Design an enzyme around this catalytic site. Structure first.
Site, PDB file in Angstrom:
ATOM      1  N   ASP A   1     -29.604 -26.598 -39.477  1.00  0.00           N
ATOM      2  CA  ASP A   1     -29.459 -27.479 -38.315  1.00  0.00           C
ATOM      3  C   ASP A   1     -29.726 -26.746 -37.000  1.00  0.00           C
ATOM      4  O   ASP A   1     -28.968 -26.866 -36.034  1.00  0.00           O
ATOM      5  CB  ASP A   1     -28.093 -28.190 -38.293  1.00  0.00           C
TER       6      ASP A   1
ATOM      7  N   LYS B   1     -30.626 -26.003 -33.488  1.00  0.00           N
ATOM      8  CA  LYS B   1     -30.383 -26.953 -32.397  1.00  0.00           C
ATOM      9  C   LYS B   1     -30.356 -26.231 -31.054  1.00  0.00           C
ATOM     10  O   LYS B   1     -30.364 -25.003 -31.006  1.00  0.00           O
ATOM     11  CB  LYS B   1     -29.075 -27.707 -32.645  1.00  0.00           C
TER      12      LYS B   1
ATOM     13  N   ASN C   1     -28.380 -23.150 -30.183  1.00  0.00           N
ATOM     14  CA  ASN C   1     -28.809 -21.860 -30.738  1.00  0.00           C
ATOM     15  C   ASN C   1     -29.802 -21.136 -29.836  1.00  0.00           C
ATOM     16  O   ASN C   1     -30.265 -20.030 -30.151  1.00  0.00           O
ATOM     17  CB  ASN C   1     -29.460 -22.027 -32.117  1.00  0.00           C
TER      18      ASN C   1
ATOM     19  N   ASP D   1     -29.411 -15.493 -34.016  1.00  0.00           N
ATOM     20  CA  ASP D   1     -29.550 -15.409 -35.467  1.00  0.00           C
ATOM     21  C   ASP D   1     -28.305 -15.847 -36.233  1.00  0.00           C
ATOM     22  O   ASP D   1     -28.230 -15.680 -37.457  1.00  0.00           O
ATOM     23  CB  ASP D   1     -30.019 -14.010 -35.915  1.00  0.00           C
TER      24      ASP D   1
ATOM     25  N   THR E   1     -25.174 -30.465 -37.383  1.00  0.00           N
ATOM     26  CA  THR E   1     -25.426 -31.541 -36.429  1.00  0.00           C
ATOM     27  C   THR E   1     -26.541 -32.415 -36.983  1.00  0.00           C
ATOM     28  O   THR E   1     -27.704 -32.005 -37.040  1.00  0.00           O
ATOM     29  CB  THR E   1     -25.795 -30.987 -35.043  1.00  0.00           C
TER      30      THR E   1
HETATM   31  C1  LIG Z   1     -19.352 -22.329 -28.467  1.00  0.00           C
HETATM   32  C2  LIG Z   1     -19.033 -20.874 -28.353  1.00  0.00           C
HETATM   33  O1  LIG Z   1     -17.907 -20.452 -28.666  1.00  0.00           O
HETATM   34  O2  LIG Z   1     -19.942 -20.038 -27.727  1.00  0.00           O
HETATM   35  C3  LIG Z   1     -19.536 -18.849 -27.133  1.00  0.00           C
HETATM   36  C4  LIG Z   1     -19.606 -18.954 -25.598  1.00  0.00           C
HETATM   37  O3  LIG Z   1     -18.748 -19.959 -25.153  1.00  0.00           O
HETATM   38  C5  LIG Z   1     -19.245 -20.858 -24.223  1.00  0.00           C
HETATM   39  C6  LIG Z   1     -18.429 -22.117 -23.867  1.00  0.00           C
HETATM   40  O4  LIG Z   1     -20.275 -20.579 -23.583  1.00  0.00           O
HETATM   41  C7  LIG Z   1     -19.294 -17.680 -24.955  1.00  0.00           C
HETATM   42  O5  LIG Z   1     -17.970 -17.353 -25.251  1.00  0.00           O
HETATM   43  C8  LIG Z   1     -20.225 -16.578 -25.470  1.00  0.00           C
HETATM   44  O6  LIG Z   1     -21.530 -16.887 -25.031  1.00  0.00           O
HETATM   45  C9  LIG Z   1     -22.516 -16.050 -25.567  1.00  0.00           C
HETATM   46  C10 LIG Z   1     -23.518 -16.549 -26.302  1.00  0.00           C
HETATM   47  C11 LIG Z   1     -23.761 -18.025 -26.618  1.00  0.00           C
HETATM   48  C12 LIG Z   1     -23.342 -18.990 -25.715  1.00  0.00           C
HETATM   49  C13 LIG Z   1     -23.629 -20.336 -25.987  1.00  0.00           C
HETATM   50  C14 LIG Z   1     -24.371 -20.667 -27.118  1.00  0.00           C
HETATM   51  O7  LIG Z   1     -24.650 -22.009 -27.371  1.00  0.00           O
HETATM   52  C15 LIG Z   1     -24.835 -19.683 -28.000  1.00  0.00           C
HETATM   53  C16 LIG Z   1     -24.548 -18.351 -27.729  1.00  0.00           C
HETATM   54  O8  LIG Z   1     -24.518 -15.741 -26.843  1.00  0.00           O
HETATM   55  C17 LIG Z   1     -24.560 -14.251 -26.610  1.00  0.00           C
HETATM   56  C18 LIG Z   1     -25.580 -13.557 -27.196  1.00  0.00           C
HETATM   57  C19 LIG Z   1     -25.624 -12.206 -26.995  1.00  0.00           C
HETATM   58  O9  LIG Z   1     -26.652 -11.538 -27.589  1.00  0.00           O
HETATM   59  C20 LIG Z   1     -24.647 -11.550 -26.255  1.00  0.00           C
HETATM   60  C21 LIG Z   1     -23.624 -12.289 -25.694  1.00  0.00           C
HETATM   61  O10 LIG Z   1     -22.619 -11.659 -24.922  1.00  0.00           O
HETATM   62  C22 LIG Z   1     -23.570 -13.647 -25.883  1.00  0.00           C
HETATM   63  C23 LIG Z   1     -22.472 -14.541 -25.289  1.00  0.00           C
HETATM   64  O11 LIG Z   1     -21.563 -14.024 -24.622  1.00  0.00           O
HETATM   65  O12 LIG Z   1     -20.075 -16.524 -26.851  1.00  0.00           O
HETATM   66  C24 LIG Z   1     -20.363 -17.670 -27.585  1.00  0.00           C
HETATM   67  C25 LIG Z   1     -20.221 -17.410 -29.087  1.00  0.00           C
END
Ligand SMILES: CC(=O)O[C@@H]1[C@@H](OC(C)=O)[C@@H](O)[C@H](Oc2c(-c3ccc(O)cc3)oc3cc(O)cc(O)c3c2=O)O[C@H]1C
Length: 287
Positions: free
Chosen positions: A139, A141, A144, A157, A172
């Site tokens: 999924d 989306k 990602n 990934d 989704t």
């Molecule tokens: C829904 C969820 O829990 O996503 C969280 C993020 O939370 C939100 C609300 O943005 C944020 O905490 C943080 O955001 C990052 C993200 C990310 C944010 C939104 C997404 O839809 C997908 C990913 O990706 C990263 C990738 C990196 O290589 C390094 C990072 O610090 C983050 C990074 O800090 O971590 C994510 C796993």
């Protein structure tokens, strides 16, 4: 509640909080609080990573489908480690300075076909590379899809999902291919359907198969005849039709040449794939 899906590479070296030296604490806007850390031991000893500590998050760990050591890909950010400790989920990720969400951009702009060619081209390289690593999205989306400080695509990934009974896979529906909705077996070709949904959504700002509820949407993915927006170019329409073949065997990208079937399509005729891979083509939008 969020669920993170970690596709672990074969020969993965399990980790814990003690394998990491804390270097810095950063506020990364939409990413929230990010710790910059240094790996202490193992194959990637001394590597710098971003660390996220999530409260109330579920971890799902999945297997992927020559003894190679992985190197970076220009359009992917990786989840290297994910481990739970005292009610907290630790994610160790590629450091992504000034990263942002693709959905932030898509809400703000009206994409033209020219714009979409760029983003989808980087995405195609990323997705195919993940396929080579043995990752199947199911999924794929917009959640990602990230953008780096330069405005280039970074495909995660790892999976992200919003979660009475628990399911091992929570997809989704709008982005799922028919054969995925069927739960009767699928391959990487399912992700090219999702790629088409992403493309459709980028071009139109709407989803191609959308019902009042999950059940109806599922019915539509299986049986609904897609009303192709006539404002789209013949080339865009052609690519979408070929990605939205319900029989995965007939779907563009399903043949032995895989992504090359997409790269060769007339929609992408203007793309220099080598220049693209070298990050020598500028994004339509610069953060
Ligand atoms: C829904 C969820 O829990 O996503 C969280 C993020 O939370 C939100 C609300 O943005 C944020 O905490 C943080 O955001 C990052 C993200 C990310 C944010 C939104 C997404 O839809 C997908 C990913 O990706 C990263 C990738 C990196 O290589 C390094 C990072 O610090 C983050 C990074 O800090 O971590 C994510 C796993």
């Amino acid at each position: 509640e969020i669920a993170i899906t970690h596709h672990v590479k074969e020969g993965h070296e399990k980790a814990d909080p003690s394998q990491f030296e804390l270097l810095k604490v950063l506020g990364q806007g939409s990413f929230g609080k990010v710790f910059l850390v240094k790996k202490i031991s193992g194959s990637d000893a001394r590597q710098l990573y971003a660390m996220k500590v999530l409260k109330k998050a579920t971890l799902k760990v999945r297997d992927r489908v020559d003894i190679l050591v992985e190197v970076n890909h220009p359009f992917i950010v990786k989840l290297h480690y994910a481990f739970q400790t005292e009610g907290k989920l630790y994610l160790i990720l590629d450091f992504l300075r000034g990263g942002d969400l693709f959905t932030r951009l898509s809400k703000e702009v009206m994409f033209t076909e020219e714009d979409v060619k760029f983003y989808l081209a980087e995405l195609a390289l990323a997705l195919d590379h993940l396929h080579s690593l043995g990752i199947i999205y199911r999924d794929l989306k917009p959640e990602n899809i990230l953008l780096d400080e330069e405005g280039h695509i970074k495909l995660t990934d790892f999976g992200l999902s919003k979660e009475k009974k628990a399911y091992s896979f929570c997809g989704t529906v709008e982005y799922m291919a028919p054969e995925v909705v069927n739960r009767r077996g699928h391959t990487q070709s399912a992700d090219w359907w999702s790629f088409g949904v992403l493309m459709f959504e980028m071009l139109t700002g709407t989803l191609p198969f959308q019902g009042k509820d999950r059940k109806e949407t599922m019915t539509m993915i299986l049986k609904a005849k897609l009303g192709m927006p006539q404002f789209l170019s013949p080339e865009a329409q052609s690519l979408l039709r070929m990605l939205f073949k319900r029989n995965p065997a007939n779907r563009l990208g399903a043949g032995p040449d895989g992504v090359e079937e997409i790269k060769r399509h007339s929609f992408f005729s203007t793309i220099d794939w080598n220049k693209l891979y070298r990050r020598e083509i500028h994004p339509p939008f610069k953060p």
